[PDB]
């Protein structure tokens, strides 16, 4: 009963030639509301980053569990960094995570 | 206290311009607005700062514009509605850019071509079968709320005059009854488990209640069939 | 872990003039499955009636249930009874209703 | 046995007649076909009783037709298959019209006017953050599978080679990546819950996969860049 988000490790793939830094927030011990607990990031100039949910999954063990993913290019990364993610309800949130 | 938005429930015709308000908590120096749509994450849309604008980015048409004047009153207001406007905005607040924050109840948002697509709920309760009371000794009534446009609507279970929330349990988000047709309406159910000896007892209430919003009183209305305004819907019975 | 439907005792509402016969089949003790336990009912003629789901819900006692009512006016009363619902996964079924 | 259908994933172009197969278990006197749409329940279509079908009631349009002349294996074919026969059709069998239902795998269908929409999976897998390690001594892989159409995918984990099942925790179905546009493709995520000591093992090998089903061989394609024919997509990393 008690929501716990996490950004993992980034990684790096390919679109159109460019590199693409791709990262996620995986927000744990989340109920089984009839809403959920809505995922958003935050970046380095103050903006924040719009991203993609999965929607709350309910877990083998009888949890419940909402993912979201976002993207952007590796160029950037010098300036959306370091990086947070948020979720709840209030809202929850997780440590900065230096991009760079 | 804390952080309260109004209307909580707007539906409004295409072409028709419409404003939100927001109160923030007292002593909360920085201000969000987000808009969730298609079940998507909070998306960001503009960001106060002590009655000041430092971020726009979220914004996508020009048509949409917030002010802070007083400092602890916010206001979204949108010129021209559309349809991609059709969505749930939602304020934050806090202490500053670097502090925790406080969401509101939004506000729910649907525009659509022509209002006289908006309809009540048609709600209606069952009774528990036999064979679930002899077998599992519990009780369950099912309600419906059905042919209802928007699915703007609150369920909430009257047992004996007071409201429940115990054994209640009521679907996430109001299914359309015709998936393929880009305008169709709304349904919803909800389930109450009591025991089987309180079922057993005609003395006891239930009632369920379906609190729709509609029309207000300042939109005009043609049809001369009734008029789909801010209502509720309840069906009752009693036990045996 | 084990399906139950139950057909819960008909109502009588009023649609254009004509009085509505209006039944409802609960399963109950459904898992949390990425699918569902589909609902379909058969009626006297031998004939299948199509209805309306409302897919599986979490309960708030870590439970997950399928609805599904069905309409029929009450002239054919004499055609259809007596009715069945079926669930599952094999699938599971219920006794006859006899609706009259 | 039991029973059993072909093909599971059946993806064609509007105006192009299919056809489907079952082969019900042996010893059944009845025969079932079922359509799910729109997550509504099966909805009935014809019944075959020994080679023999006595109702036609679920028929639609007059473009399906199913045969059974051997008596055991039967055959669903749609002539000039539209976008409203784009659902799953089941096939059911009993000893009679009196007695429970067996269920196969069933059909999955979908039109589309250009096969050109269709596309493979883009996997990508992530590793467990160190806060969760920490924190709860267990370790969470995540997989996405985006950028596919038709919604066509079965996801699994293998660990060292051998697929598991355990602590998988998948979406109940794939998602829209732009719910608005009528021809959008399709997201989906997967989580597999390992201990914080079976992930900090180097030698151990996870990988995500996701069985996508496209275009056969006997379709024709005209794009010089690839072929979204069946085929599967994974992503591994090792432990730490
Ligand atoms: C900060 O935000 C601005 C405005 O979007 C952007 O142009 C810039 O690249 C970002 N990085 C810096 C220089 O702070
Ligand atoms: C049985 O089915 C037929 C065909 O749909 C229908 O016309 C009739 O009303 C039903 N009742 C009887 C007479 O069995």
């Given at each position: 009963?008690?929501?716990?988000?996490?950004?993992?490790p980034p990684?790096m793939?390919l679109?159109?030639?460019?590199?693409?830094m791709?990262?996620?927030?995986?927000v744990?011990?989340?109920?089984?509301?009839g809403?959920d607990?809505?995922?958003?990031?935050?970046?380095?100039?103050?903006?924040?980053?719009?991203?993609?949910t999965?929607?709350?999954?309910?877990?083998?063990?009888?949890?419940?569990?909402?993912?979201?993913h976002?993207?952007?290019?590796?160029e950037?990364?010098?300036?959306?960094?370091?990086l947070?993610?948020?979720?709840?309800?209030?809202?929850?949130?997780t440590?900065?995570?230096?991009?760079? | 206290?804390?952080?309260?938005?109004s209307?909580?429930?707007k539906?409004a015709?295409?072409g028709q311009?419409?404003?939100?308000?927001?109160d923030?908590?007292?002593?909360?120096?920085?201000?969000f607005?987000?808009?969730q749509?298609?079940?998507?994450?909070?998306?960001?849309?503009?960001?106060?700062?002590?009655?000041?604008?430092?971020?726009?980015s979220g914004?996508?048409?020009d048509?949409?514009?917030?002010?802070?004047?007083?400092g602890?009153?916010?206001?979204?207001?949108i010129?021209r509605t559309?349809?991609?406007?059709?969505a749930?905005?939602?304020?934050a607040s806090?202490?500053?850019?670097?502090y925790?924050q406080?969401?509101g109840?939004?506000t729910?948002?649907?525009?659509?071509?022509?209002?006289?697509?908006?309809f009540?709920?048609?709600?209606?309760?069952?009774?528990?079968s036999?064979?679930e009371?002899?077998?599992t000794?519990?009780?369950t009534?099912?309600?419906?709320?059905?042919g209802?446009?928007?699915d703007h609507?609150?369920?909430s279970w009257?047992?004996?005059?007071?409201?429940?929330?115990?054994?209640?349990s009521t679907?996430?988000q109001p299914l359309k009854?015709q998936?393929?047709?880009?305008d169709s309406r709304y349904c919803?159910?909800?389930?109450?488990?009591?025991?089987?000896?309180?079922?057993?007892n005609?003395?006891?209430h239930?009632?369920?209640?379906?609190?729709?919003?509609g029309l207000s009183?300042?939109?005009?209305?043609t049809?001369?069939?009734a008029?789909?305004v801010?209502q509720i819907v309840?069906?009752?019975?009693?036990?045996?």
């Open positions: 009963g008690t929501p716990f988000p996490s950004l993992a990684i793939l679109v159109d030639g460019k590199q693409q791709v990262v996620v927030c995986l744990l011990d989340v109920a089984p509301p809403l607990s809505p995922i958003w990031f935050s970046a380095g100039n103050g903006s924040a980053l719009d991203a993609f999965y929607g709350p999954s309910p877990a083998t063990d009888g949890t419940w569990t909402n993912l979201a976002l993207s952007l290019p590796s950037e990364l010098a300036s959306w960094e370091p947070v993610c948020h979720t709840g309800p209030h809202s929850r949130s440590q900065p995570m230096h991009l760079s | 206290m804390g952080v309260s938005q209307p909580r429930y539906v015709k295409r311009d419409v404003a939100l308000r927001c923030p908590i007292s002593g909360h120096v920085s201000l607005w987000y808009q749509a298609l079940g998507q994450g909070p998306e960001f849309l503009t960001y106060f700062q002590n009655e000041a604008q430092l971020d726009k914004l996508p048409s048509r949409f514009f917030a002010e802070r004047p007083e602890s009153v916010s206001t979204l207001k010129q559309q349809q991609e406007d059709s749930v905005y939602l304020c806090s202490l500053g850019q670097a925790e406080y969401f109840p939004g729910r948002l649907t525009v659509t071509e022509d209002l006289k697509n908006v009540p709920p048609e709600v209606a309760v069952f009774e528990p036999e064979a009371i002899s077998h000794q519990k009780a009534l099912v309600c419906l709320a059905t209802f446009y928007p609507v609150e369920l009257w047992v004996n005059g007071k409201e429940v929330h115990s054994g209640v679907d996430p009854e998936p393929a047709l880009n919803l159910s909800s389930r109450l488990r009591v025991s089987a000896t309180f079922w057993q005609p003395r006891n239930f009632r369920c209640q379906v609190q729709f919003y009183e300042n939109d005009e209305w049809q001369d069939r008029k789909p801010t309840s069906a009752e019975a009693w036990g045996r």
